[PDB]
Amino acid sequence: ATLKDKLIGHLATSQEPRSYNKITVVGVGAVGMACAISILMKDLADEVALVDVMEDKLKGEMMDLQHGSLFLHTAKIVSGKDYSVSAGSKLVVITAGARQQEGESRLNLVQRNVNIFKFIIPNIVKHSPDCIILVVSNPVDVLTYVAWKLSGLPMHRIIGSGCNLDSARFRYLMGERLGVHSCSCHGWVIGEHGDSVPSVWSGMNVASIKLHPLDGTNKDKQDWKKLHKDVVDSAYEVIKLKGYTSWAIGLSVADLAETIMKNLCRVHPVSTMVKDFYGIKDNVFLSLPCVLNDHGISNIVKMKLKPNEEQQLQKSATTLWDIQKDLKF
Amino acid sequence: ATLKDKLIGHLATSQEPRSYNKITVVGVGAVGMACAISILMKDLADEVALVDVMEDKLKGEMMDLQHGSLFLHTAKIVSGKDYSVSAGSKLVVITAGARQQEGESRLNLVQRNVNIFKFIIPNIVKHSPDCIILVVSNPVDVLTYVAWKLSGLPMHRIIGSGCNLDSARFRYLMGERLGVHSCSCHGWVIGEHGDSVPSVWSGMNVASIKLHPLDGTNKDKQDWKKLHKDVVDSAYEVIKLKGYTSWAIGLSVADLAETIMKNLCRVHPVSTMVKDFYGIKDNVFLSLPCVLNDHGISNIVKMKLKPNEEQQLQKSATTLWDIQKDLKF
Amino acid sequence: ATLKDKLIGHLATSQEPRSYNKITVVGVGAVGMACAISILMKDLADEVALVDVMEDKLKGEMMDLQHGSLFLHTAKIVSGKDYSVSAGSKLVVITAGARQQEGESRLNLVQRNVNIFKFIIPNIVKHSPDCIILVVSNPVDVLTYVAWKLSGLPMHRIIGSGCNLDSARFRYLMGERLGVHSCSCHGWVIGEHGDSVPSVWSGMNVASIKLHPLDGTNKDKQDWKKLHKDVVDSAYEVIKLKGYTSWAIGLSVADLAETIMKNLCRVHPVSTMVKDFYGIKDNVFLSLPCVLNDHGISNIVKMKLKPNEEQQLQKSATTLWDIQKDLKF
Amino acid sequence: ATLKDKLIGHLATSQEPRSYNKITVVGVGAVGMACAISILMKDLADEVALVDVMEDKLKGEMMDLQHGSLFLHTAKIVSGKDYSVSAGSKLVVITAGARQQEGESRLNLVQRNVNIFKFIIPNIVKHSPDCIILVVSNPVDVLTYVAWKLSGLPMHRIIGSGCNLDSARFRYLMGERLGVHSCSCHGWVIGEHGDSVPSVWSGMNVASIKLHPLDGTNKDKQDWKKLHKDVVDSAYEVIKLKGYTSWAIGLSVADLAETIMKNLCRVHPVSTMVKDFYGIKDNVFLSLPCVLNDHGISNIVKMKLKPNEEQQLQKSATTLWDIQKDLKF
């Protein structure tokens, strides 16, 4: 007799608690919490662990989600600065890092973020030797390359959020113009998560109907190219208006964790090793259409690129090697 | 003082209950309940009304869903043989009708189902003058034509479930072979909901990549045509094994009610008036890619059909006119 | 022939777009977007309208949600400073207003927020004469009183978010201690959304088992009273750590919009007219357990309060009248 | 070069597919598919395996769900008569067995179902040594006892669906009368899943308000006892109208699998070992309020039963021992 002793009986038998679908969101900032509320809301994990160097912020964000437990189906929300909190995660999502000030390219953030990465990746792997690492930080393509190097994980367990967002942005504008739910519109953005992103004009379709063979001049005149245009600009506009981007990437990331936690084998433009494809010579990471499952990237989809697109992918891959080349370890 | 008087107070103010997103599923059979449990589960309507001539069956099915209210977010489930139960529905889904015995074509059901239709459509319209009618009964293409004629509703408020299912079936097999979630696979089935269904080989794609320009011989050799093959066969197999088809169409229908109840403007292969498209001369109904909203079909998507497909659509449209022609009113 | 003309056909028939389940979130701040992302995610409305005086912030938040359309089932997201944007809303959620600086009581915000209210309520009612107004702003109890007065709407269409959050907070701590999902724990917080909130010790239960008759001393010794304690403190902690509260109220609000948009008739502690209950003499608003539907508060639940609780409710109602009394119109 | 070779590339790295949240529904009948469509729809497992002795029926049901993959988030649906198909399930739900003909008590099914059980339990455990077994078959209380004996699994990994349904049925009728969503109504049914079920009159509440102290005579006069009445009758009515019960138990079961697959620790009336509680002397299984997690029953909730209820539980436990006693192994 205590309250709990008087209410709660026990059977002869029982075993230690254990969570089997754990996800760790590293970084409890704008993007941080956006990914975290998305996942919570999609009941993707039975456990969510937040990690951040900022200790007050972490605990308040933790607390704030915990007060909402009644309204969820995620049995455990934990948090701490010590990476021990993240042990046995199936997915580790990284969000730590400086962000773009307005007008600053994502590429300008490489040194700042490499330096954070160099501290975070050892501990991650330390505590979850078999996880899948999902980088979101910018410059996301370069950072997925770093994370892979520093980590030594099989290439397939390292993914960048990459162009999933870009392609989402593209298909929303397509939708806006054709007057069709973005989900019914099919168009792909690959290459860098940034200013040198390639738009696959010859893949664009609504119900398998090629926009290119209907228009022809698509790749160029009628300001259809503006769609690509608004796509590269979009991060910059949102930043100047709002200050940062949060909610689109939370969703874009949750989409990705779903395919993974459900072993769904869906095609998503994310960041991978592009070496040996389309004549690329180096260890460069960029988005291509990838098949994802519960163990990472299952397969890459080989795109039959037109001459100009293929030329665009080449450039993309180039602006990024000139950056990796000079990465000091 | 009564139980309720002692517990439940009242404010000075209040107004009559009223439901604003009502859906009536007419027919409480296999397909009946499949559509009904799908919708319930997607919280699409604030009210669900079932109607059937079979009075014991209706009330038990009603009862059975009602006992599950705690586990739902649909405030009202009602039922009755008198079409008064369905008044002010935003969507009316018809499921009443004989079904295929094994080996029987859907076309063989026309007389049986016309005769039911002739009793059901007047009352429907009677009680919900502004609804959207969704036919599911077979032969679904012919029945959406009947329903339209007998009803006199603006063509856009009359839809057949049509090829939404067929195309779902197609993309599942595509998925099975490429090793990609059916949702990432894009392929379209149009024409009749049946044996003369046209498969658009030149629309087939994964990430905007045309399977046709990669293969070429697609429309013919390598048994890729078998996919189309298994698609026409599928209803017949399921029937001989199981006796009928239920769960695939429930889902296919819910998908459709969603786009409608959410005014989402998504593209779905459903049955419409094909007159004046692809050289079709008559008042024939078949599936084409349609844009749907909260008021019905918003727009048709004009497909750039290849010579053989276009020839297939023509045949389809023909096997069906020879049937409508002879419909006695 | 244009792109769209070549792709998109038309039937003989069609009708004007119109949305039928519209919700307007007034205020695109922390709480603002939390309520807005919750609702979006629960597919509660076919249309979401944001309104704010801050024009850059509004448009960027609008834009940011729009870029996420593919990942939702809400056909329309709109925004503007002119209340015309909100016309024909079924629900209007108000979030505009100063917020607590750390250590500041919610009561200190009355003058600031009355002054905003005096500008916002006329236009709301102007544009949606039949809506349901949901106040969230603080001090929420006083503001639902203002909104009602200035508006002249039937008392039942005016609701405060009130103690739904408080009671959520209570049941999370209960859960934490008994070792039971907060949803399986039943405990109620009523009275002011603030420091004088009454906790109904004699309603507390897990599976209809009264914690009070098991403990007895519950209302006082064993620090069970600390639960109430942490509940009043909670807003203040989160504020000092994080700066404001957002995510718990977004969820708490969505829960409320659900019951409404689904005509579910669920019991929620929200703010109403308490006049004539428990000896209250004045036009005071506080949370009591209310039945909600698609037209507002359907019914109040009469609580059989114990002598001390009833005494607590009285005090609560008193600290709030001393404040309404002096409201200058 | 093959289709797939031309489209699908490979990284240097990759690992064997594996599913980590597997559920096996044994029995592809009415109840069978109801549980299976519920779970599918709640994205509870990354893999669903159906097992049945009836081979045509199994494969067609399998096929029928597979054709609906596009419309789900469950990567794998499998099926087979050989229990090898079920290896490494986290949850095994048993549905195999005769069902009640109208007017037949659940108790009459014991011999028929024991005999099936004796074949099924060895293979289950054979193939998934660490699973959680969920019995649904009738008489469910007796069958969870059998399953435990024959299996030798730690008592906590064996659960009966039990009174979760009964209590759902109770709270729907409560709701019907008070005019409150069944979820806001709290009332508990324990004891046998059948004719001797005990209703806890003294636990009944809406917002922690005791219906008993408001009424007093509750346990007896005013036909409030009819609610209990309709609860025991309900299975029998549905059977005579419809032929069997399916959809309520599918949902009731999914609710249960959720708490389990999400390690939510929620309280559910299910079947357990009641030995040593309320003076029960024997190895009897009946529903009591239990805390469930990812490893089974975590804890029992000790109810403070009134004298008559406690007397009811005793009887219940007795009608069931007289049946177990004589079970021939």
Ligand SMILES: NC(=O)c1ccc[n+]([C@@H]2O[C@H](COP(=O)([O-])OP(=O)(O)OC[C@H]3O[C@@H](n4cnc5c(N)ncnc54)[C@H](O)[C@@H]3O)[C@@H](O)[C@H]2O)c1
């Ligand atoms: N790839 C995409 O689509 C995309 C989209 C938007 C934003 N981003 C990027 O996301 C990152 C975060 O953006 P933000 O707006 O949330 O920034 P922000 O100001 O919120 O900073 C994020 C956080 O990272 C933390 N952090 C710093 N060093 C840390 C360390 N050693 N360990 C753990 N956490 C640490 C900070 O304490 C803070 O919580 C930036 O790199 C930004 O460029 C990427």
Ligand SMILES: NC(=O)c1ccc[n+]([C@@H]2O[C@H](COP(=O)([O-])OP(=O)(O)OC[C@H]3O[C@@H](n4cnc5c(N)ncnc54)[C@H](O)[C@@H]3O)[C@@H](O)[C@H]2O)c1
């Ligand atoms: N288009 C599709 O994709 C598709 C898929 C499968 C099944 N179907 C069709 O669905 C229809 C029903 O199939 P089923 O398997 O459920 O058949 P079924 O045996 O269950 O018959 C359906 C029901 O319709 C009722 N009905 C008969 N006349 C009625 C009337 N006047 N008013 C109301 N209800 C009445 C019956 O009482 C019964 O409840 C059949 O036409 C079948 O061919 C269509």
Ligand SMILES: NC(=O)c1ccc[n+]([C@@H]2O[C@H](COP(=O)([O-])OP(=O)(O)OC[C@H]3O[C@@H](n4cnc5c(N)ncnc54)[C@H](O)[C@@H]3O)[C@@H](O)[C@H]2O)c1
């Ligand atoms: N009741 C609850 O549970 C609860 C919980 C938390 C916060 N709140 C309250 O929510 C309100 C907003 O809190 P916050 O943290 O989001 O504050 P905040 O700083 O974000 O301010 C909210 C916004 O209101 C806008 N606003 C100001 N005047 C306006 C006008 N005339 N028309 C429209 N919008 C106008 C501002 O531009 C800003 O967008 C505060 O009153 C806070 O106390 C209530």
Ligand SMILES: NC(=O)c1ccc[n+]([C@@H]2O[C@H](COP(=O)([O-])OP(=O)(O)OC[C@H]3O[C@@H](n4cnc5c(N)ncnc54)[C@H](O)[C@@H]3O)[C@@H](O)[C@H]2O)c1
């Ligand atoms: N506990 C509850 O709440 C509850 C509710 C309703 C129904 N039930 C029970 O569910 C059980 C099934 O009911 P039903 O209506 O679906 O019956 P049913 O006719 O559909 O029979 C179910 C199935 O079990 C299969 N089966 C028989 N022996 C088998 C074996 N050795 N291995 C595997 N499968 C085998 C049959 O082939 C068939 O697929 C019955 O015991 C019924 O009483 C329980």
